[PDB]
C-alpha cells in the first residue's frame, strides 16, 4: 504494498511523524514501505525500522504473557476455550509480525549489507525476531532456537573483529544474546559469562570515547550490570 506509490523520502518523513505521535503500527508500515524501495538504509533509517517493529512486537509480547499466565492458572473451574482461542489469536499476530521482519531481512537487507555496522545490525535483528518466535514456540522449537543462536553468533564474530568494545550495537547485541542464553536456551552460566566479559572489555575501552560516546556506551553497560545483579 500500500506504500508503493509514495516517495521514499516521504515515507521516511512520515515515519518520523508517526514516532513523535507514538503511532508505531503506522511507523512500521511506512518503514516497510521504505525498505521495499530496494535502496540500502542509512544509519538513521535502520534505527527507525528497529524502533518501529520493537514497539509493535513489544505490545504483542506483553499481551501474550498476560494471557499465557491466565491460561496456565486455569489448568490447576472449567471456563471454556475462550482464553486459549484469544491467546492463539494474539500469538498468531505476533508470529505474522516476526515473519514480516524476517522476510524483509531475507529480501534483501542482509545480502546487500556489506559493511560490518549494517551487517551486525541486521543479524542482531534476525536473532531477536527468532528469539521472540522461540518464546511462544511449543511444537519447531529446536529449529527456531538454532536459527536465533546462529544469527547472534555470526553477528558476534563480525562485531568482535570489526568494532570497538564500546560500540553501542556491539554492547546491545551482547546484552540480547545473553538474555537468549538465560531465558531461551537454558544456559544461565553462558549468560553470566558473556555479560561479564562484555562489561569488562567495554570498561577498559571507555578512555577512548568522547563525552557523547561515553554517555551512550555507559547506558547499556548499566543494563548488563542490572542483569548480572539479578542473575548472580
Amino acid at each position: 504494498g500500500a506504500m508503493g506509490s509514495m516517495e521514499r523520502a516521504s515515507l521516511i518523513q512520515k515515519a518520523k511523524l508517526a514516532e513523535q505521535a507514538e503511532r508505531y503500527e503506522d511507523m512500521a508500515a511506512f518503514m516497510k514501505g521504505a525498505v521495499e524501495k530496494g535502496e540500502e538504509l542509512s544509519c538513521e533509517e535502520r534505527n527507525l525500522l528497529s524502533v518501529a517493529y520493537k514497539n509493535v512486537v513489544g505490545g504483542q509480547r506483553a499481551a501474550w504473557r498476560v494471557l499465557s499466565s491466565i491460561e496456565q492458572k486455569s489448568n490447576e473451574e472449567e471456563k471454556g476455550p475462550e482464553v486459549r482461542e484469544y491467546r492463539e489469536k494474539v500469538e498468531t499476530e505476533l508470529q505474522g509480525v516476526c515473519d514480516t521482519v524476517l522476510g524483509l531481512l531475507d529480501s534483501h537487507l542482509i545480502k546487500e549489507a556489506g559493511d560490518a555496522e549494517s551487517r551486525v545490525f541486521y543479524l542482531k535483528m534476525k536473532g531477536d525476531y527468532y528469539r521472540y518466535l522461540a518464546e511462544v514456540a511449543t511444537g519447531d522449537k529446536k529449529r527456531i532456537i538454532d536459527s536465533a543462536r546462529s544469527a547472534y553468533q555470526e553477528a558476534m564474530d563480525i562485531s568482535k573483529k570489526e568494532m570497538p568494545p564500546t560500540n553501542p550495537i556491539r554492547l546491545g547485541l551482547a546484552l540480547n544474546f545473553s538474555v537468549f542464553h538465560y531465558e531461551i536456551a537454558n544456559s544461565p552460566e553462558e549468560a553470566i559469562s558473556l555479560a561479564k566479559t562484555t562489561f569488562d572489555e567495554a570498561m577498559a575501552d571507555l578512555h577512548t570515547l568522547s563525552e557523547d560516546s561515553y554517555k551512550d556506551s555507559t547506558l547499556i553497560m548499566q543494563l548488563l550490570r542490572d542483569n548480572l545483579t539479578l542473575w548472580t
Binding site: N47, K54, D128, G172, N176, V179, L223, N227, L230, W231
Partner: peptide, 9 residues
C-alpha cells in the same frame, strides 16, 4: 526478569 536492549535507538 532480565531486561533486553530497549528503544534507545
Amino acid at each position: 526478569r532480565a531486561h533486553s536492549c530497549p528503544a534507545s535507538l
